[PDB]
Amino acid sequence: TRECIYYNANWELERTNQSGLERCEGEQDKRLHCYASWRNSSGTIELVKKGCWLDDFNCYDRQECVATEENPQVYFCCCEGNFCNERFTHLP
Amino acid sequence: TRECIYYNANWELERTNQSGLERCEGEQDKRLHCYASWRNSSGTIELVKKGCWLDDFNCYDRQECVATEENPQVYFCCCEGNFCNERFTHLP
Amino acid sequence: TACRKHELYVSFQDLGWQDWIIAPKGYAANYCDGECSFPLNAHMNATNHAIVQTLVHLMNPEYVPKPCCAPTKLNAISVLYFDDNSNVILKKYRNMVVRACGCH
Amino acid sequence: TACRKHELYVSFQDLGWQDWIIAPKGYAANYCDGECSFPLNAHMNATNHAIVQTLVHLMNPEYVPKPCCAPTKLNAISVLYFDDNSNVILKKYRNMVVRACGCH
Amino acid sequence: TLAPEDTLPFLKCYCSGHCPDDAINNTCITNGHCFAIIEEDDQGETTLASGCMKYEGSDFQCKDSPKAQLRRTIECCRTNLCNQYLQPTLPP
Amino acid sequence: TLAPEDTLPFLKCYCSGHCPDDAINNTCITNGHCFAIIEEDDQGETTLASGCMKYEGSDFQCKDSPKAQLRRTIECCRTNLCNQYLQPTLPP
Ligand SMILES: *[C@@H]1O[C@H](CO)[C@@H](O[C@@H]2O[C@H](CO)[C@@H](O[C@@H]3O[C@H](CO)[C@@H](O)[C@H](O)[C@@H]3O)[C@H](O)[C@H]2NC(C)=O)[C@H](O)[C@H]1NC(C)=O
Ligand SMILES: *[C@@H]1O[C@H](CO)[C@@H](O[C@@H]2O[C@H](CO)[C@@H](O[C@@H]3O[C@H](CO)[C@@H](O)[C@H](O)[C@@H]3O)[C@H](O)[C@H]2NC(C)=O)[C@H](O)[C@H]1NC(C)=O
Ligand SMILES: *[C@@H]1O[C@H](CO)[C@@H](O[C@@H]2O[C@H](CO)[C@@H](O[C@@H]3O[C@H](CO)[C@@H](O)[C@H](O)[C@@H]3O)[C@H](O)[C@H]2NC(C)=O)[C@H](O)[C@H]1NC(C)=O
Ligand SMILES: *[C@@H]1O[C@H](CO)[C@@H](O[C@@H]2O[C@H](CO)[C@@H](O[C@@H]3O[C@H](CO)[C@@H](O)[C@H](O)[C@@H]3O)[C@H](O)[C@H]2NC(C)=O)[C@H](O)[C@H]1NC(C)=O
Ligand SMILES: *[C@@H]1O[C@H](CO)[C@@H](O[C@@H]2O[C@H](CO)[C@@H](O)[C@H](O)[C@H]2NC(C)=O)[C@H](O)[C@H]1NC(C)=O
Ligand SMILES: *[C@@H]1O[C@H](CO)[C@@H](O[C@@H]2O[C@H](CO)[C@@H](O)[C@H](O)[C@H]2NC(C)=O)[C@H](O)[C@H]1NC(C)=O
Ligand SMILES: *[C@@H]1O[C@H](CO)[C@@H](O)[C@H](O)[C@H]1NC(C)=O
Ligand SMILES: *[C@@H]1O[C@H](CO)[C@@H](O)[C@H](O)[C@H]1NC(C)=O
């Protein structure tokens, strides 16, 4: 019953939506999270994909989208809640 | 898509039909047979159960209901076809 | 050796059920046997988790065992058996014979 | 020893996929292990054919082997992986983690 | 309305051998039968076991041992905690 | 319309090792990919194999061997009978 902010830079590739509000759909008795993944390079921020995510251990009871990876190619953060795909940070 | 003659002596026990025409229902790519089982004792014939039967090796391409068992408690014969539950015999 | 549906005919006469089974007096209950090894082909029907497990088995052959050759499709058989009060009862026993196999 | 869903966390870092898997960097793919012996209880989820096979194994312990402790319920996991042209792609890989187990 | 092989768990069985992760005070919530097996493994030491069946396939697992290498006796009672006060003895 | 993991079998793969019961003139009708594995078992004798994948899980089975005890190389081509004229060689 979750809801995230769906964003996709490859909308023209697969004939999909570049943004919008995505209502989450998942299995029963299972939690549903939101995810945000972007590209950071020398102070420039370029979001690639935001949306829904199935049950995952890495984002249990997190109210914000904080990426803990130390300098990966694409930053990723998982958050449990409603509309937690609004903002993001790279605090490791 | 088969059809057999459904007969049951215990109709009052399970609130079912004592006779009738039963349309067979089985899995796809599988054959469906009819079966007839009765009680024979010193020349007396008393049918107990006639109806449908799933895929079975014992009644491949048999156009009649012939019981091959040598003097069992309840005679049984399996036949492949449509309305092959009409008659039966005890030729071993 | 590979994941393969073998043939096995089990007779109720030698299974002690000849007293309460009118018919059939024995059916073909094909048993599933073989081994599942990398790679898992098209005919060796496999799941994503089976592939992941058989890939983990590559690095750690002792911690995690290989997937198992287990049935994937089953069919029911009709059985006309006696009751406790010598009553004839027909029942379609589900999941009795094996139609296919695969790595689980 | 019994049919029991064990716990196993497999990390893509040691599986050589760290170059094309953005996240997750490792998921809990519980593996299924144990032994299936007569009788098969309520929690050891079993089929009619598994019971028939484990009953035939009683008389002939050499001809027919015992049923196998294999998964019965599986769940999908979301994976955000790279493509061949360095394109980020999300996919829900089905049948990845084990939720239950039983004798097959 | 609903099949007896997928029947809602109501029966209560007792627990000495086969004993699940969530049985409380050695009590299994089952839907089939209650069973008590007195198999003694090969070595003279004798064993005991009392647990809950899954109903599917119990027709096969509730008759006496037809022709098995060891000797076993399994009583299938459908009364709550009937396997409690049960001490079988293998017949020669 | 239909998922790519349950895609209709169309591709044609060749057959030297893993070879099904109904492949005609060593030809498998598949829906995933065509693969050719040159694993040599422990003993100096070397082996060869060419067959058809099931597409599900091929993403894992189509990269090079990450860290395995023996050495293997698997080329996943989607062209009809591409694994035919393929002779891989394990790199040191
Ligand atoms: C994209 O990458 C840039 C560059 O790495 C990130 O800027 C970084 O922002 C963090 C915010 O916590 C800065 O860390 C903090 O900075 C100051 C001292 O400079 C102080 O508040 C703390 O001690 C802490 O170190 C970090 O310095 C800064 N990096 C640079 C090179 O200036 C940015 O956050 C990234 N954005 C996203 C959306 O990932
Ligand atoms: C119910 O049981 C009775 C009694 O066993 C069956 O009667 C039997 O009918 C068969 C028909 O083939 C007879 O066999 C044939 O009989 C004559 C010689 O008597 C001859 O045509 C053949 O050489 C062959 O032997 C059999 O003799 C007869 N039994 C008796 C005791 O008279 C009857 O068929 C059974 N009915 C059903 C529906 O099962
Ligand atoms: C994986 O699942 C598939 C699909 O159920 C199994 O494929 C099946 O394989 C059998 C054995 O070859 C096929 O039966 C044969 O088919 C043809 C019919 O013209 C003929 O060669 C034989 O008379 C025989 O009946 C069966 O058709 C085939 N099923 C399908 C849908 O193609 C496969 O066996 C499973 N894997 C394992 C390891 O069991
Ligand atoms: C046979 O299938 C059943 C049904 O899927 C499996 O039963 C499941 O067993 C697990 C492990 O005990 C249960 O999880 C536990 O449940 C309660 C929740 O209050 C608690 O004790 C623990 O926190 C844990 O989550 C699970 O609920 C249960 N499923 C059902 C529907 O009752 C069983 O494990 C399978 N057999 C084998 C051998 O795996
Ligand atoms: C996906 O895209 C469609 C089509 O663009 C969205 O429907 C509306 O499209 C118009 C333009 O035609 C936008 O201005 C609107 O914002 C879109 N939304 C609404 C509510 O009118 C559609 O909503 C998008 N999302 C989904 C889930 O289909
Ligand atoms: C099962 O029994 C019902 C009810 O008896 C059958 O319906 C008809 O019932 C009347 C008596 O009420 C009989 O005289 C008729 O012969 C029955 N059939 C028809 C076609 O009218 C019903 O047909 C039986 N069979 C099934 C499959 O439901
Ligand atoms: C279980 O047993 C404990 C002590 O062993 C007792 O206090 C309690 O009544 C029992 N509870 C349940 C839920 O059976
Ligand atoms: C298979 O090969 C035979 C000879 O091996 C040949 O005559 C025939 O063309 C081929 N048939 C098919 C269906 O591939």
Residue numbers in the entry:
A (entry chain F), B (entry chain A): 26 to 117
C (entry chain E), D (entry chain B): 410 to 513
E (entry chain D), F (entry chain C): 50 to 141
Lines from the paper:
ALK2 is a type I receptor that binds two different ligand classes of the BMP/TGF-β superfamily: the BMPs and the Activins. With BMP ligands, ALK2 signals to play roles in bone modeling, while with activins, ALK2 regulates signaling by forming nonsignaling complexes. To explore, at the molecular level, how ALK2 interacts with its cognate ligands, we utilized cryoelectron microscopy (cryoEM) to resolve the ternary complex structures of ALK2:ActRIIB:BMP6 and ALK3:ActRIIB:BMP6. The overall complex assembly of ligand:receptors is consistent with previous BMP complex structures, with the type II receptor binding at the convex, “knuckle” of the β-ribbons and the type I receptor binding at the interface built from the concave fold of the fingers and the wrist helix.
We used a similar experimental setup to resolve the structure of ALK3-ActRIIB bound to BMP6 to 3.3Å with residues, ALK3 (50 to 141), ActRIIB (26 to 117), and BMP6 mature domain (410 to 513), being well-resolved. During interaction with ALK3, BMP6 buries a total of ~1,325.4 Å2, similar to that of ALK3:BMP2 (25), while only burying 1,113.8 Å2 while engaging ALK2. Conversely, ALK3 caps the wrist helix with residue Gln117, engaging Asn469 of the posthelical loop of BMP6, whereas ALK2 does not. This interaction is facilitated by a three amino acid extension in the β4β5 loop of ALK3, not present in ALK2. Given the lack of direct binding between the carbohydrate moiety of BMP6 and ALK2, it remains curious why ALK2 is reliant on the presence of the carbohydrates for BMP6 binding, whereas ALK3 is not. Comparison between the CryoEM structure of ALK2:BMP6 and ALK3:BMP6 reveals the presence of a salt bridge between ALK3 residue Asp69 and BMP6 residue Arg413, which sterically occludes the previously mentioned His452 driven hydrophobic contacts in BMP6. We hypothesized that ALK3 utilizes this salt bridge to stabilize the prehelix loop without relying on the carbohydrate moiety. Conversely, deglycosylation of BMP6 does not reduce binding to ALK3-ActRIIB-Fc to the same degree (KD of 30.0 pM and 35.1 pM for BMP6 and dgBMP6, respectively). In contrast, BMP2 binding was similar between ALK3 and ALK3.D69G, where only introduction of the β1β2 from ALK2 reduces binding significantly. These data support that the salt bridge between ALK3 Asp69 and BMP6 Arg413 stabilizes binding and constitutes an alternative strategy to stabilize the prehelix loop in the absence of glycosylation. With ALK2, BMP6 utilizes a glycosylation on Asn454 to form interchain contacts that stabilize the prehelix in the active conformation, whereas with ALK3, BMP6 utilizes a salt bridge to stabilize the same interface.
